[PDB]
Amino acid sequence: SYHLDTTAPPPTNLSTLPNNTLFHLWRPRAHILPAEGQIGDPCAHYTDPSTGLFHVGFLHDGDGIAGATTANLATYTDTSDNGSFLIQPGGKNDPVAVFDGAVIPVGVNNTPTLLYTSVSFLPIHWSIPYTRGSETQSLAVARDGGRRFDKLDQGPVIADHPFAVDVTAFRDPFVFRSARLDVLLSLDEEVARNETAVQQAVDGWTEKNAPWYVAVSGGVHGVGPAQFLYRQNGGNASEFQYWEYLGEWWQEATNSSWGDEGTWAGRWGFNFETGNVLFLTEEGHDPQTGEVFVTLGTEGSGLPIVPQVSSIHDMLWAAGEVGVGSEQEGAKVEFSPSMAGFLDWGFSAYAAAGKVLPASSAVSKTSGVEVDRYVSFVWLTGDQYEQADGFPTAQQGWTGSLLLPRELKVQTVENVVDNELVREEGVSWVVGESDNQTATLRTLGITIARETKAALLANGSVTAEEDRTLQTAAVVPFAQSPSSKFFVLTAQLEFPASARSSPLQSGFEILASELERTAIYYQFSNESLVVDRSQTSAAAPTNPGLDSFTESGKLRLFDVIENGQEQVETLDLTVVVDNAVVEVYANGRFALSTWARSWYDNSTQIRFFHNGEGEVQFRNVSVSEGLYNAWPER
Amino acid sequence: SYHLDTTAPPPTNLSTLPNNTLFHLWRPRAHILPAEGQIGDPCAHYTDPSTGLFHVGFLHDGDGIAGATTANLATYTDTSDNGSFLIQPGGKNDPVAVFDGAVIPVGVNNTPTLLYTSVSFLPIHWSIPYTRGSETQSLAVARDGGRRFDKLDQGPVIADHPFAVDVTAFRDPFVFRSARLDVLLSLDEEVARNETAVQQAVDGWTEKNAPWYVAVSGGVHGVGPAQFLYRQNGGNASEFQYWEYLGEWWQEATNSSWGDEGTWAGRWGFNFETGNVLFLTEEGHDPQTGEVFVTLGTEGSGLPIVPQVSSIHDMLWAAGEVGVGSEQEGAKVEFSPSMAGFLDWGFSAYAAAGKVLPASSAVSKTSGVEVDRYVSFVWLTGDQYEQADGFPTAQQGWTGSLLLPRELKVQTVENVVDNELVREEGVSWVVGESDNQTATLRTLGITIARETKAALLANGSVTAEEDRTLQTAAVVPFAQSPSSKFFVLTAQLEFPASARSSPLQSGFEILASELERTAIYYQFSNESLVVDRSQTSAAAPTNPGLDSFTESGKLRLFDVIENGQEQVETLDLTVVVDNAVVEVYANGRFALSTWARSWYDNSTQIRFFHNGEGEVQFRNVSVSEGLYNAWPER
Ligand SMILES: OC[C@H]1O[C@@H](O)[C@H](O)[C@@H](O)[C@@H]1O
Ligand SMILES: OC[C@H]1O[C@@H](O)[C@H](O)[C@@H](O)[C@@H]1O
Structure with missing residues (x-):
């Protein structure tokens, strides 16, 4: 006997729970899947x-x-x-x-x-x-x-x-x-x-x-x-x-x-x-x-x-x-x-x-x-x-x-x-x-x-964040984070030409709380967008079935001229989170999707992240919460 | 119901009989077929x-x-x-x-x-x-x-x-x-x-x-x-x-x-x-x-x-x-x-x-x-x-x-x-x-x-018939006919060249009794060995299932020199009668097979046949009765 209490620590072995008990835990609402x-x-x-x-x-x-x-x-x-x-x-x-x-x-x-x-x-x-x-x-x-x-x-x-x-x-x-x-x-x-x-x-x-x-x-x-x-x-x-x-x-x-x-x-x-x-x-x-x-x-x-x-x-x-x-x-x-x-x-x-x-x-x-x-x-x-x-x-x-x-x-x-x-x-x-x-x-x-x-x-609640520039290592919580795990995060990260050769890592921490967090960040060392899921689920430690390995994809930000002046191409991010389904889009030419199966109801905080290597400017950062129901008839 | 009595007239409609009642009536003993x-x-x-x-x-x-x-x-x-x-x-x-x-x-x-x-x-x-x-x-x-x-x-x-x-x-x-x-x-x-x-x-x-x-x-x-x-x-x-x-x-x-x-x-x-x-x-x-x-x-x-x-x-x-x-x-x-x-x-x-x-x-x-x-x-x-x-x-x-x-x-x-x-x-x-x-x-x-x-x-009874030359039309019974429908008939027919243009038909009548008979004869009109089954089965008239149409095959007897003298090639016949299964072989280069489903136990008479057109000499005519059991284990 066990009622799913996602405000309490997860049981040691999730596989010992009754059938269908985790049905809604990380199921998306705006995605295509059978009943x-x-x-x-x-x-x-x-x-x-x-x-x-x-x-x-x-x-x-x-x-x-x-x-x-x-x-x-x-x-x-x-x-x-x-x-x-x-x-x-x-x-x-x-x-x-x-x-x-x-x-x-x-x-x-x-x-x-x-x-x-x-x-x-x-x-x-x-x-x-x-x-x-x-x-x-x-x-x-x-x-x-x-x-x-x-x-x-x-x-x-x-x-x-x-x-x-x-x-x-x-x-x-x-x-x-x-x-x-x-x-x-x-x-x-x-x-x-x-x-x-x-x-x-x-x-x-x-x-x-x-x-x-x-x-x-x-x-x-x-x-x-x-x-x-x-x-x-x-x-x-x-x-x-x-x-x-x-x-x-x-x-x-x-x-x-x-x-x-x-x-x-x-x-x-x-x-x-x-x-x-x-x-x-x-x-x-x-x-x-x-x-x-x-x-x-x-x-x-x-x-x-x-x-x-x-x-x-x-x-x-x-x-x-x-x-x-x-x-x-x-x-x-x-x-x-x-x-x-x-x-x-x-x-x-x-x-x-x-x-x-x-x-x-x-x-x-x-x-x-x-x-x-x-x-x-x-x-x-x-x-x-x-x-x-x-x-x-x-x-x-x-x-x-x-x-x-x-x-x-x-x-x-x-x-x-x-x-x-x-x-x-x-x-x-x-x-x-x-x-x-x-x-x-x-x-x-x-x-x-x-x-x-x-x-x-369409019917999402919009919350913007003030433009910000991080230089020293930091993790700054949003002034207001979503209260659920259904939202679209958009942001633009501007980097200096000197960042290319740096060990810089700049991005965001999502689906976060004290015991859980999922990090999404750009890394110049190998020019890749990275999704660190090492701390994503408080349940993963004793349930190896919940994969926690790092996901990543290559994305080169070229040198471009925007106004007579050369600059590192802006990193245009759009991250769609539908419960555990996480999709990272960038510059209309990149996509990296994975499962981020956080456990706690309160793991909905969002934070700015910078490892202090180099500098990064965040612009047009905003969050739309709610998404929609892709299956009205169900 | 009806106890198969093959010494009595057949019933009008054979299909009204019980299953398997006709199982042995015309089943061969020396041929390959399932149990x-x-x-x-x-x-x-x-x-x-x-x-x-x-x-x-x-x-x-x-x-x-x-x-x-x-x-x-x-x-x-x-x-x-x-x-x-x-x-x-x-x-x-x-x-x-x-x-x-x-x-x-x-x-x-x-x-x-x-x-x-x-x-x-x-x-x-x-x-x-x-x-x-x-x-x-x-x-x-x-x-x-x-x-x-x-x-x-x-x-x-x-x-x-x-x-x-x-x-x-x-x-x-x-x-x-x-x-x-x-x-x-x-x-x-x-x-x-x-x-x-x-x-x-x-x-x-x-x-x-x-x-x-x-x-x-x-x-x-x-x-x-x-x-x-x-x-x-x-x-x-x-x-x-x-x-x-x-x-x-x-x-x-x-x-x-x-x-x-x-x-x-x-x-x-x-x-x-x-x-x-x-x-x-x-x-x-x-x-x-x-x-x-x-x-x-x-x-x-x-x-x-x-x-x-x-x-x-x-x-x-x-x-x-x-x-x-x-x-x-x-x-x-x-x-x-x-x-x-x-x-x-x-x-x-x-x-x-x-x-x-x-x-x-x-x-x-x-x-x-x-x-x-x-x-x-x-x-x-x-x-x-x-x-x-x-x-x-x-x-x-x-x-x-x-x-x-x-x-x-x-x-x-x-x-x-x-x-x-x-x-x-x-x-x-x-x-x-x-x-x-x-x-x-x-x-x-x-x-x-x-x-x-x-x-x-191998184990068949042998009965030969005297050489005979038929000139007028005639049907002459063998001096001794087999007593069963399992035998091998061999014969040689010699024709004169004049017979090629004649309406000649010469051969034998087999599986015969008063009410039934099957005719097997050579015909020069169209150079063919013929099997006339119009009178083969006393049961065929009311049972159309028993086909009675004439069967025939082309066989040309060439002009040959056998002793510095030219003659019409000898028709060398070998007729195997394995119950209703009848196989007519000739000169080692011809085969004509058919079903001769006679009804009466007594339809086992064999007769010489000649239509009186032209002449024919029958030689080395013999009958071996009995054949053998091809399936010793059944
Ligand atoms: O099972 C048949 C095939 O299914 C595919 O979807 C898998 O990728 C293959 O590894 C497999 O051989
Ligand atoms: O059922 C299929 C085939 O069987 C053959 O033995 C028949 O002679 C054909 O007419 C027929 O197309």
């Missing part, structure tokens, strides 16, 4: 052509894909009760399980069609032999407003991985259209080599009748991770049965990495997962004019390898160009990375599943958005990918959550001093334009979906 | 390398493959009780059914391995759209002396039919080795054009490390029937997982036929089934020196087509050569017929499944055979392929039977006058040599497996 149970990879999102509603999907309880719908990209509604499942295993093609899938809005019977990985054998992991027929790609059609997906009555449409290729994995199909690919696959190995003649065809490209491409993720044993590319046979937009294989359009050597030291974009690892193919512009998504971007998860491991265990799950992104399939007899087209980085630096952040959100959607119509966007949903595993040291799961009654929907586009950083900080190799940006004096950088833009950001602040 | 129930296509035969025993397989009750073993090819033993099943559906690869398969003696784990068509969807028929994933090819390994075949724990090894090819069917894998094919696929495009340099390579071939080939039967919608050829990837005899597609090595236009009139080899039809690839010599089988022979069933139909109904099931064979796949980009190798015919002319004869029977087998060692042979088992559907007009199946308690095992080799007809009878187009033979005076013909040789023939005669 209960666990949530795995998001997937199968789409805009219903009929209603204009945006459908969101995600694996649930390891027993299929569940769904929800939204008309504003702020509040959601479960497609049904009892789990809200759309499709589950037990069919002829998926007797064992239902893995990730993607949706063609107008496919079979001119309705939303799901191409998903139907599983017939387990286990499946890059570190152990692959069982033939493990993963196949099958079709299902949406029924009753999309509240359910009925499997087509036949075998998989892609019943096997590439011939005689020893794949490590062959799952997570993602569908997309591309003027570039279409053109490259219709010209001559000479008339398609000159980017000139090509562009002429691109300008005349029409999306409506363009064929669909499918990128499948995995790798090849003893060779390396890769993405297998397919497209409706013969480029026939009306062909949903046969998909011609275009080869491994994207591959890397086993455990190789972007850059000469794997500093900015982790490692390619031993296997690719959940690849999404995007075409971004400076305003949003355009399969005709956008640049090719790819988001993916990579599975890593230290040595020695522990078969069936992926010690590292990196949530990466890469940008580059696509060209003809060389002269050799391999892939018909190839993707070459020109820059890469992380979509989210969080250890537990992974398997992002996104989708183009049309300006014609009911969402964009309402918010007055005139362009097409690409919204990405990142997964935040609740138990370190099932490697947690006895997390109190039965006590919590739920596991995992998705992160806030994020808009992806091409971000530009103007007026950047063209120096070594810019010209480094194996980096997460490229020079869009320069004059040897100042340049304009190009990188992946990452922001909270505008409607979600607005809803988070 | 009870129905038998479908024979398949999966093989010689156990360990024991030397020959294993026989067949579909049973439409619920899998059952088996039996033999050490002498005379008597058999069920592999197990309760159906004696080896493998049945319900696996992940074959959730719906288990179709025909073939066995590689030394395969996975160096044990007998079954490659079979695993079925996931029904219906399947050339006349209706094909459901993707309907038929795949999976592996299973023999366990416990072969009394069972355990499916390998993974998906099919050939998970889909050729890419984007709208097949009518894709089943019945048959495995085989070939020096010729290996050579052709190892030389250049021009080096494999000159039979000279090609023969050198063949002479050095070695079966031990030769890769396995797999022929799958079916067709292509709107194109025609065909055989799909595959072989262990890269010619690697050690590779059982991946099979490279070599193309449609054998195809024919929809419902086309051998010859300008479909006279000698029926029609190619709308779909090919049960294709077996053989390499025959004048003494038996040799994958190194034998001429390519193929046996197959073809599904036919008159117009208008009745979807899901194959009105004609022809049991055909074809011989020819295999060359490099033309110049274009089609099948890598190609089979070109030089002659074709019927393996069995019976309406109900079909789906032959054979296998190489090594001289190293226990069967051959015992009987002292020094060469490898090819033994073929022909199916005799019990109910006109399930199109019977209400056959009393419940009353009989069993359905179908296989015909006697038959030896297939190259047969030679020597001293044949090289005239128009030999040079007709689209025929079942080819001239092996000639001097414009006499020639030697080459054709498919069909004889009863020697050990089975010997067993049929």
Whole structure:
């Protein structure tokens, strides 16, 4: 017998508590997750052509894909009760399980069609032999407003991985259209080599009748991770049965990495997962004019390898160009990375599943958005990918959550001093334009979906803090801190050029009280935003299931000219705290999410933090408390 | 109710009788059939390398493959009780059914391995759209002396039919080795054009490390029937997982036929089934020196087509050569017929499944055979392929039977006058040599497996009849007729050349009494051996289920020189009557099998028959009564 008293010390072993007793303790209110149970990879999102509603999907309880719908990209509604499942295993093609899938809005019977990985054998992991027929790609059609997906009555449409290729994995199909690919696959190995003649065809490209491409993720044993590319046979937009294989359009050597030291974009690892193919512009998504971007998860491991265990799950992104399939007899087209980085630096952040959100959607119509966007949903595993040291799961009654929907586009950083900080190799940006004096950088833009950001602040209480400058080491409490763990903290930190070489650490302490605190700070030593959770939970000491290791992500603040005078680029911070789900956003190009499971009701204080190394100026600091309820119907 | 009294008239409607009351009425004793129930296509035969025993397989009750073993090819033993099943559906690869398969003696784990068509969807028929994933090819390994075949724990090894090819069917894998094919696929495009340099390579071939080939039967919608050829990837005899597609090595236009009139080899039809690839010599089988022979069933139909109904099931064979796949980009190798015919002319004869029977087998060692042979088992559907007009199946308690095992080799007809009878187009033979005076013909040789023939005669009572010459029309009873419906009738009929243009019909009446009789005679009008069953069963008139239509097969008796004198080749008849199962053999190159379901115990009289047109000399006429028990353990 035990009533949850979060004003008293936590019991020694949380796992000895009755089921569902910790259900509300760290559950978010503005995030996407099922009514209960666990949530795995998001997937199968789409805009219903009929209603204009945006459908969101995600694996649930390891027993299929569940769904929800939204008309504003702020509040959601479960497609049904009892789990809200759309499709589950037990069919002829998926007797064992239902893995990730993607949706063609107008496919079979001119309705939303799901191409998903139907599983017939387990286990499946890059570190152990692959069982033939493990993963196949099958079709299902949406029924009753999309509240359910009925499997087509036949075998998989892609019943096997590439011939005689020893794949490590062959799952997570993602569908997309591309003027570039279409053109490259219709010209001559000479008339398609000159980017000139090509562009002429691109300008005349029409999306409506363009064929669909499918990128499948995995790798090849003893060779390396890769993405297998397919497209409706013969480029026939009306062909949903046969998909011609275009080869491994994207591959890397086993455990190789972007850059000469794997500093900015982790490692390619031993296997690719959940690849999404995007075409971004400076305003949003355009399969005709956008640049090719790819988001993916990579599975890593230290040595020695522990078969069936992926010690590292990196949530990466890469940008580059696509060209003809060389002269050799391999892939018909190839993707070459020109820059890469992380979509989210969080250890537990992974398997992002996104989708183009049309300006014609009911969402964009309402918010007055005139362009097409690409919204990405990142997964935040609740138990370190099932490697947690006895997390109190039965006590919590739920596991995992998705992160806030994020808009992806091409971000530009103007007026950047063209120096070594810019010209480094194996980096997460490229020079869009320069004059040897100042340049304009190009990188992946990452922001909270505008409607979600607005809803988070809509009915919130606003409390600002006075501008401040810290030089000597200090921890200064806010003049007034929130009274709950649901708020958005925003702030700008200005650093002196002399801080680059200093051991400076400046930021904030959140979710704090006498016995608990979570520190978020910038560090120049390795140019990273850091989330120290060593003191985050008073319950973690005796409950190793609550991970407390430090989280961090790289963020370079370039030298820029703002008013004729050079200065270190301002660090623009936006930290969203929804209970235990903590998301750190910066300069519209950085994201780091993690779990901050504080125990006490009173751990809501916020404080300025500076280690006394160097100096820091805090500006436009403010806190919006309350957020909102993303699930009104529950 | 009614106690079966076969000395009294049959009841008007046989279906009103209790179950199993007709179980023994027309059941054979020397044929291969299950203890009870129905038998479908024979398949999966093989010689156990360990024991030397020959294993026989067949579909049973439409619920899998059952088996039996033999050490002498005379008597058999069920592999197990309760159906004696080896493998049945319900696996992940074959959730719906288990179709025909073939066995590689030394395969996975160096044990007998079954490659079979695993079925996931029904219906399947050339006349209706094909459901993707309907038929795949999976592996299973023999366990416990072969009394069972355990499916390998993974998906099919050939998970889909050729890419984007709208097949009518894709089943019945048959495995085989070939020096010729290996050579052709190892030389250049021009080096494999000159039979000279090609023969050198063949002479050095070695079966031990030769890769396995797999022929799958079916067709292509709107194109025609065909055989799909595959072989262990890269010619690697050690590779059982991946099979490279070599193309449609054998195809024919929809419902086309051998010859300008479909006279000698029926029609190619709308779909090919049960294709077996053989390499025959004048003494038996040799994958190194034998001429390519193929046996197959073809599904036919008159117009208008009745979807899901194959009105004609022809049991055909074809011989020819295999060359490099033309110049274009089609099948890598190609089979070109030089002659074709019927393996069995019976309406109900079909789906032959054979296998190489090594001289190293226990069967051959015992009987002292020094060469490898090819033994073929022909199916005799019990109910006109399930199109019977209400056959009393419940009353009989069993359905179908296989015909006697038959030896297939190259047969030679020597001293044949090289005239128009030999040079007709689209025929079942080819001239092996000639001097414009006499020639030697080459054709498919069909004889009863020697050990089975010997067993049929071993303990039988012999009764000869005096040589006789009938000139007027007459029906003359034998001086002494058998007293049972288990006997072997042999005879030789000599005709004068003048008989070729005559309306002559000469032969015998068997299974006769006052109220019943079955006529078997040769007819020069259309050069055919005929089995008239219009009076076969006193029960047929009120039981349409008992088919009574005339059965016939083409047999040309050439002009030959036997003693410096020309004569019409002797018609050498061997008629095996194994109860209702009747098999008519002639000149070692013809077979016609059917069901002769006489009712009365006394219908065992045999008579000479001549229609008075022309003349006929009967010689060496004899009857061996009794046959033998093929299943001593039952
Ligand atoms: O269980 C199948 C696969 O699921 C993926 O989500 C994991 O990241 C892999 O390590 C695993 O092999
Ligand atoms: O059920 C499937 C197939 O079985 C074969 O034996 C029949 O002869 C075909 O007509 C049929 O398509």
